[PDB]
Amino acid sequence: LQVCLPKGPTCCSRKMEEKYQLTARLNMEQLLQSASMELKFLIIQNAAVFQEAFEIVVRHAKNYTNAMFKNNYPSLTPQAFEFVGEFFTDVSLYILGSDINVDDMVNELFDSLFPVIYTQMMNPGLDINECLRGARRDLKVFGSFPKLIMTQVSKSLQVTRIFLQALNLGIEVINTTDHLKFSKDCGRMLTRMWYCSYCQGLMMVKPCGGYCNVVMQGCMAGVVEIDKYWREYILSLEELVNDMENVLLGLFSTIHDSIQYVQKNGGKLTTTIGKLCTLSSRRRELIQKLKSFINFYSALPGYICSHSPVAENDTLCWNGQELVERYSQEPVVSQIIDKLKHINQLLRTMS
Amino acid sequence: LQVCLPKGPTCCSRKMEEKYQLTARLNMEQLLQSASMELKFLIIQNAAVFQEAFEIVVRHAKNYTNAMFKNNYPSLTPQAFEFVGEFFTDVSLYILGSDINVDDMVNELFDSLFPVIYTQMMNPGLDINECLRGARRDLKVFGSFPKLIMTQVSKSLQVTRIFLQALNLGIEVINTTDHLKFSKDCGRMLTRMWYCSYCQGLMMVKPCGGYCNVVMQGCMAGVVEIDKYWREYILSLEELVNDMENVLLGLFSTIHDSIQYVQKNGGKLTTTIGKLCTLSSRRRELIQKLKSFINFYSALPGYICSHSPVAENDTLCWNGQELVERYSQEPVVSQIIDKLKHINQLLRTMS
Amino acid sequence: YLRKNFEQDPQGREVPIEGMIVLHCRPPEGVPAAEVEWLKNEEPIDSEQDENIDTRADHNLIIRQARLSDSGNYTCMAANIVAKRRSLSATVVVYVNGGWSSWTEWSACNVRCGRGWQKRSRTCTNPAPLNGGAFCEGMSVQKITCTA
Amino acid sequence: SLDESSGLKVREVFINVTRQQVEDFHGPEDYWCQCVAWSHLGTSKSRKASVRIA
Ligand SMILES: *[C@@H]1O[C@H](CO)[C@@H](O)[C@H](O)[C@H]1NC(C)=O
Ligand SMILES: *[C@@H]1O[C@H](CO)[C@@H](O)[C@H](O)[C@H]1NC(C)=O
Ligand SMILES: *[C@@H]1O[C@H](CO)[C@@H](O)[C@H](O)[C@H]1NC(C)=O
Ligand SMILES: *[C@@H]1O[C@H](CO)[C@@H](O)[C@H](O)[C@H]1NC(C)=O
Ligand SMILES: *[C@H]1O[C@H](CO)[C@@H](O)[C@H](O)[C@@H]1O
């Protein structure tokens, strides 16, 4: 045998020892999953809700911009629908982590918007399109409106993008916790603590509380080190919540005022161009519920021992090898800590 | 037999046929080497002579610059000798084809020159050296002198470098000609034309002139196609010769005037810095001698037949299989043409 | 819908005269699937015109020998029923390394009596550097003192 | 010189080597130098120190 220390005879072979080891693995995984389930479901719920809510906000803002174009500038439709749809598509693509340039979104928006304004509103009556696109930026026809929108939307979209990435990475690490594979020595110690009493012919004897403590503090020496980074993660997320609905929803008013501004100088512009050519409540409740789990990694061995069958009195208990009257007395964790450090730096910088 | 067409009996076995094939290979290679030797030695001689002449010019120019530093600016020696030697060493290294940046040569020259000027000429009396080096470019102390020298020397050094590269590549292709391996079918045809007459017991019979013509135009179909590119190479080299001695030799006057220019603003500069911190004959003779070999690739099969033993009368001659009264009637080449096209484009862009 | 950002732009490469290089291109996400076309120096290349160049089903430009297809600014362009998108042009430059020469024979001692000289040349021509290839490393001439 | 460990004639020779000598030297090998000492019994050569332009 390689696990069950044979003091007398034994009622179990090597294959039964392997079966007990696999059942020990399954029991540890089930206990960790039961410890992590409440927090996992909380973060999954909130991640799903925030993702759907941001998509709803983007769709509604695109709808409102399209509706205000339909009502106030019918001469710019249906071209207006194309560039508005492209703009808000790129908005959503940026929110969901794709490589999109915010300044380029706004600049392509105004580049597409100016030629149809000139041809349908200012000078009524395809090849000259690029000359108009160049004149848009060369003559600064929209004034400071493009840079105003650029900063207004970049500031909110970056915090939203990093909020979603932080929620997803929290889900990732919490899913990793209950799937943390342990050392072989810990496998054998857990097998001894939970099952090796059956090999000695005992039916209902439980392991000592102190033996459970030494075993758990033995194989969770790495997992407990995650607690500092998890606390910093929680506090940095709290720093970040203290934004994007208001901006995307006022975009239509800002664009309308920019169109008025360009129409204001039409006299000189046409001649020159003719010559030349409940959310805040949700994030607050989320942070207040997330602060209740700041001790998650430090209380984990206590959970494993308090939810495993143990003799708390340390009397007539199993010490891993014999029935006593009184008890005598990294790689995946490294990846978790790496990702936590990364997301914590990213969080703190948006502050 | 696989080469000697047996019309009657035969005095030679298969191994004698292999021996005749290898002797045919050696004879063809020797004939090509004899054809190419004059031109190869001409280009090798000129490459060597021009290399030595350019090195002599660079050494003389470095000597002249050092002498005018000794005479006009003794306070800048011996540091002046260090940066002049480094400058002209990099000059020669660029001339000989090494990856050297001309702008970097001039900029490092002035970067090294300014601190010793400041410490010995402007403010008489190691750690502050980098602050002076930065101030050289940040305050544009040398005016337009660095860019003037930069263009002045880059223009001549690039044409000289490409002249040397062109000479070397001509050597390369002329060296390849006599090492041109041919097809197996041509090996067998040359064996028949030169030796298979011996297998039929003939002692002094020579192949027919027309048979030599068909065989040579048979295996030189690829090599003759090089003639266009070789002619264009010759003419482009002629285009290039129609410049670097004068520039490198006036360098000292230009640098002296630049030093005067910097000394002219010393009043403000010291306070601000204290607060802040027969050749043309040779290339003509070379081109006139190189134009005598413009037909080299087109006259090559004529050379092979006129220097191989052939019956020019085409009477009582060997036709590859029998003695008659009257006669009836590539990857490496691709590389040669590729390099010729490349060097010809480079030449034409230069002039 | 066609995207502006290319999924993977072609990378510029340095390849010897005999080396082989594959230029990768991942067109932007779009319905229908983007039609990838290769352009050498803003001019399309024909895969059937030369054996050395061929177009792959997964949008890759493979060059076996740097001889039949020399240097240039290769650019990948995706075409769709919506519009066209140009990728970042890759500067593919083919370099030839410097290759010296077989030694020559030692020259005769110029001086009949006393200290003489003997020279031996080693040129950089097998192969000669091209398109900015690294020059030969070391000395080109060999000189020895002789006593006649 | 005279050595302390043993009363025997010691000789120390220094020779200056300038940059101009190395850059103008076009020999086959790297600019090397050897030391030859003469005695009443014979001669002895030293290591070939090659002075090169860094
Ligand atoms: C926008 O809102 C109006 C409200 O009447 C609705 O009729 C229309 O279908 C909506 N458009 C989009 C694209 O949601
Ligand atoms: C964790 O992710 C894995 C991926 O297969 C999945 O199997 C598992 O159900 C997820 N975790 C939880 C605890 O629900
Ligand atoms: C290729 O690109 C570079 C800059 O991207 C440029 O200097 C060069 O002239 C271009 N032209 C070609 C290869 O035709
Ligand atoms: C000619 O080719 C031969 C092949 O051995 C080579 O050894 C010799 O260096 C060549 N001459 C050159 C490179 O100019
Ligand atoms: C030419 O000389 C030698 C060959 O022995 C190498 O150092 C190198 O390949 C060089 O270019």
Numbering used by the authors:
A (entry chain C), B (entry chain A): 61 to 185, 191 to 307, 314 to 348, 382 to 433, 455 to 476
C (entry chain G): 154 to 301
D (entry chain E): 100 to 153
Excerpt from the publication:
Unc5 receptors consist of two extracellular immunoglobulin domains (Ig1–2), two extracellular thrombospondin-like domains (TSP1–2), a single transmembrane helix, and a C-terminal intracellular supramodule, which contains a ZO-1/Unc5 (ZU5), an Unc5/PIDD/Ankyrin (UPA), and a death domain (DD). In agreement with previous findings (Verschueren et al., 2020), we show that Unc5 receptors directly and functionally interact with the morphogen receptor glypican-3 (GPC3). All glypicans share a similar architecture: a structured N-terminal extracellular core domain, followed by a C-terminal linker region of ∼80 amino acids (Kim et al., 2011).
To produce complex crystals, we mixed hGPC3core, mGPC3core or murine GPC3 residues 31–488 (mGPC3488) with Rattus norvegicus Unc5D residues 32–307 (rUnc5DIgIgTSP). Strikingly, all three datasets revealed an octameric assembly. The center of the octamer is formed by four Unc5D molecules that are aligned in a “head-to-tail” antiparallel bundle. Interface 1 is located at the C lobe of GPC3 and interfaces with the Ig1 and Ig2 domains of Unc5D, burying a surface of ∼690 Å2 (mGPC3 complex) or ∼640 Å2 (hGPC3 complex). The largest interface, 2, is formed between the Unc5D TSP1/Ig2 domains and the M lobe of GPC3, burying ∼1440 Å2 (mGPC3 complex) or ∼1330 Å2 (hGPC3 complex) of protein surface. Within the octameric arrangement, the antiparallel Unc5D chains also form interactions between themselves, especially at the Ig2 domains: the buried surface amounts to ∼900 Å2 and ∼840 Å2 for the major antiparallel packing interactions within the Unc5 bundle.
